[PDB]
Amino acid sequence: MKVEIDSFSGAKIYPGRGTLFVRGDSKIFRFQNSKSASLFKQRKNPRRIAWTVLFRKHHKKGITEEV
Amino acid sequence: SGNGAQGTKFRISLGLPVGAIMNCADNSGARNLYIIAVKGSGSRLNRLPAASLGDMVMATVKKGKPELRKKVMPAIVVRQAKSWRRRDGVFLYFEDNAGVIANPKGEMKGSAITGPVGKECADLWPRVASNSGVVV
Amino acid sequence: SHRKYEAPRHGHLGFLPRKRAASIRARVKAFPKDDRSKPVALTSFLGYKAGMTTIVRDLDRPGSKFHKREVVEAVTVVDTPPVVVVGVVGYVETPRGLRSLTTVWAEHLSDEVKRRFYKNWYKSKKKAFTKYSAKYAQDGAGIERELARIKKYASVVRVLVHTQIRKTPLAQKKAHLAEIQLNGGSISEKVDWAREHFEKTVAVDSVFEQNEMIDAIAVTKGHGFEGVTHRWGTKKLPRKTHRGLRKVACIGAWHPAHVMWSVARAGQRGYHSRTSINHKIYRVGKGDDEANGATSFDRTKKTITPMGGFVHYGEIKNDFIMVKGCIPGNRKRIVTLRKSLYTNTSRKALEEVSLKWIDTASKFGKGRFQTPAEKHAFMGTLKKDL
RNA sequence: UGAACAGCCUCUAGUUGAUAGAAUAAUGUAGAUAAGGGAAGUCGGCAAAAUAGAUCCGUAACUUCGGGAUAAGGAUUGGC
RNA sequence: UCUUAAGGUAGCCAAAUGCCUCGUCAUCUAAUUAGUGACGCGCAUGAAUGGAUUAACGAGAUUCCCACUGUCCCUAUCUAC
RNA sequence: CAGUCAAGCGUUCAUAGCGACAUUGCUUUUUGAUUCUUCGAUGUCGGCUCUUCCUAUCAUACCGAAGCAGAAUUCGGUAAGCGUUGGAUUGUUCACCCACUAAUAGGGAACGUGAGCUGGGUUUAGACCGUCGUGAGACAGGUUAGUUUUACCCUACUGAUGAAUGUUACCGCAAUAGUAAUUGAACUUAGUACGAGAGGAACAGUUCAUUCGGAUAAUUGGUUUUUGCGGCUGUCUGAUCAGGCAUUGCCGCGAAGCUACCAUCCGCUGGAUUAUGGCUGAACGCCUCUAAGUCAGAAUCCAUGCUAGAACGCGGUGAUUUC
Ligand SMILES: [Mg+2]
Ligand SMILES: [Mg+2]
Ligand SMILES: [Mg+2]
Ligand SMILES: [Mg+2]
Ligand SMILES: [Mg+2]
Ligand SMILES: [Mg+2]
Ligand SMILES: [Mg+2]
Ligand SMILES: [Mg+2]
Ligand SMILES: [Mg+2]
Ligand SMILES: [Mg+2]
Ligand SMILES: [Mg+2]
Ligand SMILES: [Mg+2]
Ligand SMILES: [Mg+2]
Ligand SMILES: [Mg+2]
Ligand SMILES: [Mg+2]
Ligand SMILES: [Mg+2]
Ligand SMILES: [Mg+2]
Ligand SMILES: [Mg+2]
Ligand SMILES: [Mg+2]
Ligand SMILES: [Mg+2]
Ligand SMILES: [Mg+2]
Ligand SMILES: [Mg+2]
Ligand SMILES: [Mg+2]
Ligand SMILES: [Mg+2]
Ligand SMILES: [Mg+2]
Ligand SMILES: [Mg+2]
């Protein structure tokens, strides 16, 4: 197996979990749950949601990894 | 499935009952497909025959060039838009329903495929696989 | 006139009546055919249904599309603490059916097992088997004679064992006692096996084995009084139906001037005893071992218990049995596990199974992590952490 | 509030009257929500859903020249 | 050629008026006893018994299309009494 | 609907398959004839839902015959265990086409089923047209609108308690009643057998699927009064914080439970037979599956298994009160 990375919130997706979505332009988006999937359907910018990993890195929260 | 069915496929959730209108995904010049039957479907009281990804269906063109109108022809569904569970454990779905035109043997009338196609449909009809651009 | 369009039935006529079961524990109505060649061993076991989970295993089936490729399946986990052998009974065949002739119990009984004999344990003298205990304290006077009486007769020997409810997270505090036929040989040897096992425990790994083909026997989940539409899966009446629509329109013709027994009607649904067959064991867990959920490829020290414990059940501190598919009965219910009645090759009952990874994520919702070590690693430190 | 003696909340005033208690089975009455499809149901789109205010753009056939017409079809609407 | 007092003119139609009839042709549908447009020896249309058309209007009847939806595939759940 | 005879058809040849001229029957799913019951009322067509039964078997199981080389087909037997559909038009029963399927067989149960539904038709009263009648009016001629009442009683059925069997508790037995699984496709066999070629299988094996059934909620989806969190409108509490009201104020997410071929798992093998094909073998010195005897065999029957456990069937076991 290979553990997946969520396209919206970056949360780790384990086998058998979440839903996979293929857009008409052949891009695939994987959602760990219905919560992220629904927000994606409302055109919500991941950068504007306060708990997505993309937001946290962009706002430098818990970024003590790289010096 | 039927004459052109090269191999077997696992069961996938039905998402296209009869009377559904479905997008035409090839270059044959048809715009949409109207389902009137499904090959290999069973019989039951009041149970509408339903189509799934990769199933050969008896379809009819509702929009397109006139020489494709007014006549019935086989078709093969290439996009489902309803989530189904692959035995690897994933639920996946496209954003719309799509299919192509083929003869009873499975030779596609068109020559090219627009948009991605499902891996189950491509693995089952060799001719559809050849003209498919992106397979998932 | 005749039926306009022919349609199959609704429900199963061979599963009548759909009444409540006699007891909360389903009774094994048949045991595997006995062969007097193998060593004396049990043919069943007692366990409790904890919950379901998700497993990842490489399918191995030549010719299939997913041959040597990865698949995801769902299994149920049954807690199986070892049971205590207390008492054996013999059965002599009669032209009127099998009949028990004698019962020989153990000298000492645990507190939990004898609580089954009292409907009010708290206000009681707890005088269970006290004078029967006085049958002991002499060498073999009243007991060995009864055992010999079993040997001279009683072609079929069954063993009375009870669960150790105190080892489970349940607050039941009362044991479950049941019978298991021994399918060894030389019935004189059968009772010898039982007597040596009085006041002694038996682990589940001594009965079932990996990849073995077993069966589940338990009482299903009850649902109380149920309408006909859901009790039998009948067609709902159209929307504009006066006097209700979740019914059956015609329940019988004019003649016979009676309601047939085969017409679906409203009644209690669920809580029936069922015997589900053909369920393959995947893993025989050991409670005295951490990393119960660790496979040869996972290699992480995690037990089968998910984060926050199994929903409505708790933890799996004891030995557990996890079988492919779903078994009848809800969580916290006693379940009886049985050997297969017949030898089945099927090229799928002979399949060898080796797991890859166990879904230990919390079942209390859309769980994301598998271990608090992983959760802390992902989220980093928090305000609760100092 | 709002175009408004519309609907919604409040002041003066007036009531707190309609046998009650305990549970939350089936079938009901009233109100709802439903993945994919979209009338294939049905005698029949019955019922329900969809549209809806205001501002701006645009508006066919036909015609008794008055209408059709809010035709159709589009865009905008908050707070500071 | 017989006959009436006159012999259905202008118009219109399988029309709410046509038995045969599910009339014939075209369109509409994959498929239509439905609908529409044409034909008219029309059982038994037709002129203030008013004929034909008619914009607008209609809680009037009928056909199709778009959007819409548990009407349905196929049922499921929730709340109050 | 089925026989009996057999002039002929069938290249020759009555009976592979048909069969005239005649003649014997069966059924009451047609329509007739009669008026025996009902006019101090048994709710009439059709459709929807549902159960069971019949076989004159459409398919599936196993066989027999051919004008059966193969494939396809036709006739016939045992067979009602299982299934026999989705639609366009019509109120339709009926009918006709489209399409799938193994097939889209035929019927009954007060022409099954209205205190189960609907009311499209027929079949009150309003109204329109055509024909007829001077007229009121008539028309199995056409059209439109037209109230579908009650079950709390007994039985039946599905579920649910329950006295007496010294008391109570536990573990059991099994008389009886019910029963279930069904079908197709693809690969391989094999472009082989067979055939001049054209064409062209089957048995064994594998992967699946159709219909049905019993469960279950790990995942996905649905459901929201968790009124759990957040946001938004109007008003009210001097403002803020926090809140009330708008019959759950509205929207987004939403655990648990319930739930979906919208989700997952599972659905056993033994004997005796039918039709039929055989053995030995007389009757009938020969011959014959039959007369005695006997072998194999169908989705058949009975069993294994599964369900309820006689509340007047039974067994084993623990304890069995002292003002
Ligand atoms: Mg959810
Ligand atoms: Mg129907
Ligand atoms: Mg029938
Ligand atoms: Mg179910
Ligand atoms: Mg009504
Ligand atoms: Mg959960
Ligand atoms: Mg104002
Ligand atoms: Mg006001
Ligand atoms: Mg009152
Ligand atoms: Mg219909
Ligand atoms: Mg007139
Ligand atoms: Mg009469
Ligand atoms: Mg009468
Ligand atoms: Mg009377
Ligand atoms: Mg009556
Ligand atoms: Mg017969
Ligand atoms: Mg009759
Ligand atoms: Mg009926
Ligand atoms: Mg009745
Ligand atoms: Mg009238
Ligand atoms: Mg009048
Ligand atoms: Mg007149
Ligand atoms: Mg009349
Ligand atoms: Mg029996
Ligand atoms: Mg839910
Ligand atoms: Mg012989």
Swiss-Prot record, chain A:
UniProt-listed GO biological process terms:
cytoplasmic translation; translational elongation; translational initiation
Q: What is its main location?
A: cytoplasm
Q: Which GO terms describe its cellular component?
A: cytosol; cytosolic large ribosomal subunit
- MF terms in GO: mRNA binding; RNA binding; structural constituent of ribosome
Which domain of life, per UniProt?
Eukaryota
Localization, per the record, is: Cytoplasm
List every position bearing Phosphoserine. 7
Instruction: Please share what else the UniProt entry notes about this protein.
Output: Present with 247000 molecules/cell in log phase SD medium. There are 2 genes for eL24 in yeast.
Family recorded in the similarity comment: Belongs to the eukaryotic ribosomal protein eL24 family.
Subunit architecture: Component of the large ribosomal subunit (LSU). Mature yeast ribosomes consist of a small (40S) and a large (60S) subunit. The 40S small subunit contains 1 molecule of ribosomal RNA (18S rRNA) and 33 different proteins (encoded by 57 genes). The large 60S subunit contains 3 rRNA molecules (25S, 5.8S and 5S rRNA) and 46 different proteins (encoded by 81 genes).
Q: What does this protein do?
A: Component of the ribosome, a large ribonucleoprotein complex responsible for the synthesis of proteins in the cell. The small ribosomal subunit (SSU) binds messenger RNAs (mRNAs) and translates the encoded message by selecting cognate aminoacyl-transfer RNA (tRNA) molecules. The large subunit (LSU) contains the ribosomal catalytic site termed the peptidyl transferase center (PTC), which catalyzes the formation of peptide bonds, thereby polymerizing the amino acids delivered by tRNAs into a polypeptide chain.
Q: What is this protein called?
A: Large ribosomal subunit protein eL24A
From the broadest rank down, the organism's phylogenetic lineage runs: Eukaryota, Fungi, Dikarya, Ascomycota, Saccharomycotina
Shown residues in whole-protein numbering: 1 to 67 of 155
Curated annotation (Swiss-Prot), chain B:
> How is this chain modified after translation?
Methylated by RKM1 at 2 different sites, but it is unclear which are the 2 methylated residues among Lys-39, Lys-105 and/or Lys-109.
Q: Name one Pfam family in it.
A: Ribosomal_L14
Q: Where on the chain is N6,N6-dimethyllysine found, per UniProt?
A: 105, 109
The record ties this protein, via InterPro entries, to: Ribosomal_uL14, Ribosomal_uL14_CS, Ribosomal_uL14_sf
- Which residues are annotated as modified residue N-acetylserine in the UniProt record? 1
- Location of the protein in the cell: Cytoplasm
Chain's role: Component of the ribosome, a large ribonucleoprotein complex responsible for the synthesis of proteins in the cell. The small ribosomal subunit (SSU) binds messenger RNAs (mRNAs) and translates the encoded message by selecting cognate aminoacyl-transfer RNA (tRNA) molecules. The large subunit (LSU) contains the ribosomal catalytic site termed the peptidyl transferase center (PTC), which catalyzes the formation of peptide bonds, thereby polymerizing the amino acids delivered by tRNAs into a polypeptide chain.
What else does the entry mention about this protein?
There are 2 genes for uL14 in yeast.
Q: What is this protein called?
A: Large ribosomal subunit protein uL14A
Curated annotation (Swiss-Prot), chain C:
What InterPro entries does the annotation carry? L3_arc_euk (IPR045077), Ribosomal_L3_dom_3_arc_sf (IPR044892), Ribosomal_uL3 (IPR000597), Ribosomal_uL3_CS (IPR019926), Transl_B-barrel_sf (IPR009000)
GO terms, molecular function = RNA binding; structural constituent of ribosome
A GO CC term assigned to this protein in UniProt: cytoplasm
Residue(s) carrying Phosphothreonine: 102
Which cell locations does it reside in? Cytoplasm
Reading the lineage from the top rank, the first entry is Eukaryota
Q: Which residues carry this modification: Pros-methylhistidine?
A: 242
Q: Which residues carry this modification: Phosphoserine?
A: 23, 155, 296
**Disruption effect?**
A mutant confers resistance to trichodermin, a trichotecene toxin produced by plant-pathogenic fungi.
Cross-link Glycyl lysine isopeptide (Lys-Gly) (interchain with G-Cter in ubiquitin): where in chain: 38, 135
What modifications does the entry list under PTM / processing?
Methylation at His-242 by HPM1 is required for proper 60S subunit assembly and promotes translational elongation fidelity.
Query: Which consequence is recorded for altering residue 242 to A?
Result: Cells accumulate 35S and 23S pre-rRNA precursors. Cells display defects in translation elongation resulting in decreased translational accuracy
Which GO BP terms sit in this record? cytoplasmic translation; maintenance of translational fidelity; ribosomal large subunit assembly; rRNA processing; translation; translational elongation
Sorted UniProt keywords: Cytoplasm, Isopeptide bond, Methylation, Phosphoprotein, Ribonucleoprotein, Ribosomal protein, Ubl conjugation
- Subunit composition? Component of the large ribosomal subunit (LSU). Mature yeast ribosomes consist of a small (40S) and a large (60S) subunit. The 40S small subunit contains 1 molecule of ribosomal RNA (18S rRNA) and 33 different proteins (encoded by 57 genes). The large 60S subunit contains 3 rRNA molecules (25S, 5.8S and 5S rRNA) and 46 different proteins (encoded by 81 genes). uL3 forms together with ES39L one of the contact sites for the signal recognition particle that targets ribosomes to the endoplasmic reticulum membrane.
The note filed under miscellaneous reads: Present with 450 molecules/cell in log phase SD medium.
- Protein family: Belongs to the universal ribosomal protein uL3 family.
For this entry, the protein name equals Large ribosomal subunit protein uL3
Q: Which gene encodes it?
A: RPL3
